[PDB]
Amino acid sequence: AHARLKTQLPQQKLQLQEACMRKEKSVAVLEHQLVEVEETVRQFRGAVGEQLGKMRVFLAALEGSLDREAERVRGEAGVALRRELGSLNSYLEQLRQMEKVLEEQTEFLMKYCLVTSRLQKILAESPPPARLDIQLPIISDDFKFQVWRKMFRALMPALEELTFDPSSAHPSLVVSSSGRRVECSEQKAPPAGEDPRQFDKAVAVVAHQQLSEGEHYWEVDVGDKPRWALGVIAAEAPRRGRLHAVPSQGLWLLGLREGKILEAHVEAKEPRALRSPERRPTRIGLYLSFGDGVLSFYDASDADALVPLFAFHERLPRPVYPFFDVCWHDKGKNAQPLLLVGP
Amino acid sequence: AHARLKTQLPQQKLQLQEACMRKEKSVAVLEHQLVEVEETVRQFRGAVGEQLGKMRVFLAALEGSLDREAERVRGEAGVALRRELGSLNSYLEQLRQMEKVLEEQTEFLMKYCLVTSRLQKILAESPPPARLDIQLPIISDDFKFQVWRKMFRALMPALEELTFDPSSAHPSLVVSSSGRRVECSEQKAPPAGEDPRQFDKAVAVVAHQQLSEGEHYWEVDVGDKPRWALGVIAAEAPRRGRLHAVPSQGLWLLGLREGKILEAHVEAKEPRALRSPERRPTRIGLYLSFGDGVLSFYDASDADALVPLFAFHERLPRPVYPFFDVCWHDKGKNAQPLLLVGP
Is B57 on the interface with A (CB under 8 A)? Predict the structure, then answer.
């Protein structure tokens, strides 16, 4: 019995040592967990400070602009009214000199004609009364709302530097040397090449830059173009031949056709039409955020107020090229170009 | 000739004195004009500072709330993980004591059973592994937009203290003692009195307070009430008998009828219907600003995001009572009350 216990005791000692090692590993895990919680709280504070500081720097920029405009208009008004005051003071000094000369028989008769002529000239040279016109921008109760809508365009990041690929371009379309303007050519196009990257039948161009992650925003000036489409195309999605404008094939579109109808190309038998704004879209900004997987099309005709049109909410694959369907030229009826707005 | 000139000279002196007095008056006008321009620039700076400081104090309040929540969750996590660390340290100390006891024939055999039993109890009392769960609110790219919509409710002023008049109330309607709840009574109403202030046939109540000038905002919880109307009534507008819901008689309404249809009562043959939100309105805030003459009805179901419904833009007369058409009780089908939301 003693030998069995003496042989079993090292096994118990080894088990206790293993338990102590596991406890030490758990204590190290707990310490690193506490450190990581503190670092996560610091990072959350930093990120919320970044967002709210973007809001604060927009507000400070607007306040500085308004204060500078008020200072400039006050300076101009002060300069003009001081010119008027100096002219009035000169006229008053001349009138006082004329009165002093009139206060001072032969010499009086000799000087009376000159004094009367100078007084008549001074009276006829009377400047017109000044006008109380100050044209600083007035701020009513609505003004804060005018700021609030104005905040939206400021919230979105800087316009993504996008350029048009000549290689992926449809053969009819010609891309300008700057890379921000594409338009259809009335002349006959060359036959489509064997390169699968360029579009065969869908008359469209995709931008050069490759959106990968994070928030992105880019604006397209459409003008008064009759029919077009703006959106994103999946990199794995095929391009040769006609393309179904559905998220399932890999196209997220906001195709407008026949001038008035603005239909968002959602998965269905037919792209369901949205409601047209009271004035036609001339400049539309696409906002793609990969973190929440949203793609929103904001009508930006006035840079102050951006009104939403449609927002896809499904998760987006990486990477999606921005996509611009300029469509057929239609014997000059659709010659209006889609141009990227650059900062 | 000399006598005529000598007699005419005082007339010229008096004319010069009058011209000098006019010039002095003009100089005083110019000086006061410059002072008033400087004061107007100071007042414009003060007003824009007030609006942008309202925005900044909302942003600072949100930042303080988020920072306080982060600090509280860090403190709770630290307390819990320190409890776990203390338990692990106690277990490690017990294991070290057991190992030291095992390191130290008759005495060893006597103590071996107790040491083995204590080691087995310590091994069986092993705490489960900790879980890395921190529930601070995560902020994605969308979070700033979540702030921006949240700014709207913060931009509007505090909820106007409004109470229901029992005297102007329709005879069927009963107003609670607090003054923020009105509902129809199933019992038969007394005959309408000769007082012209209360409504004869239009089943409605107007609030006690008299809006005079400036921005004002007040919220009504409608619940799931089938038919009602919210708006403003001109003080000069007659109330006895049926009232045409038009701005020309003096009623600005957002009457909802038959549950789904939400029609803004604009001047026409028929009140033109708006578009219904995807979920029914349960709480609607009216915003009246006399400076720009706007009356806007914002659907406020979530206090963060307020979506506009309709905005009258015509100039409003002073003073307009807020107006609440609770309509006929309809044998218990329309017994749901309209209650004013109070801060």
Answer: no
Q: How many residues does chain B have?
A: 343
Are the CB atoms for B280 and B291 separated by under 8 Å?
no
Q: What is the Cα B296 distance to its own chain's centre?
A: 13
DSSP E strands: which ranges in chain B?
A: 173-175, 181-184, 204-206, 215-221, 229-234, 251-253, 256-257, 261-262, 283-289, 294-299, 307-312, 320-325, 338-340
Query: In chain A, which residue's Cα lies nearest the Cα of B138?
Result: A44
Strands (E), A24-120: none
Q: Report the alpha-carbon angle A327-A330-A335, nearest 5.
A: 75
Q: Any idea what the Cα angle at residue A23 is, between residues A19 and A27, rounded to 5°?
A: 170
Mark yes or no for CB contact A34/B81 under 8 Å.
Answer: yes
Closest CA to B151 of B57, B214, B278: B57
In the beta sheet, which residues pair with residue B265? B253
The residue ranges of every structural domain in chain A are 1-133, 159-343
Q: Per the CB < 8 Å rule, is B55 touching A144?
A: yes
Q: Which residues of A touch B9 (CB under 8 A)?
A: 102, 112
B102: helix, strand or coil:
helix
Q: Is B182 helix (H, G, I), strand (E, B) or coil?
A: strand
Among the residues of A258-334, which ranges form H helices? Answer: none
Closest to B291 measured CA to CA, from A143, A282, A115, A257: A143
Rg of chain A over all Cα atoms, to the nearest angstrom = 38
- Alpha-carbon distance of A277 to A312, in angstroms, equals 19
List CB contacts of B96: < 8 A, sequence separation 6 or more: A20
CATH topology (fold) of A159-343: Jelly Rolls (2.60.120)
CATH architecture designation of domain B157-343 = Sandwich (2.60)
| Count of residues in chain A | 343
Give CA separation, B193 vs B172, B197, B199, B308, B324, in Å: 12, 10, 9, 39, 20
Where are any strands of DSSP class E within A156-302? 173-175, 181-184, 204-206, 215-221, 229-234, 251-253, 256-257, 261-262, 283-289, 294-299
Torsion sign (Cα): B52, B53, B56, B62 = negative
Give the residues across from B181 on adjacent strands.
B339
CB B200 within 8 A of CB B169: no
Concatenated DSSP letters of A205-237: EEBSS-B-SSEEEEEEE-TT-SSBEEEEEETTS
How near does any CA of chain A get to the CA of B332, in Å?
38
Query: In units of Å, what resolution does this entry have?
Result: 3.5
Cβ B13–A136 below 8 Å, yes or no?
no
Closest to B52 (Cα-Cα) out of B142, B143, B151, B145? B151
Please give the radius of gyration of chain B, using alpha carbons only, rounded to the nearest integer.
38
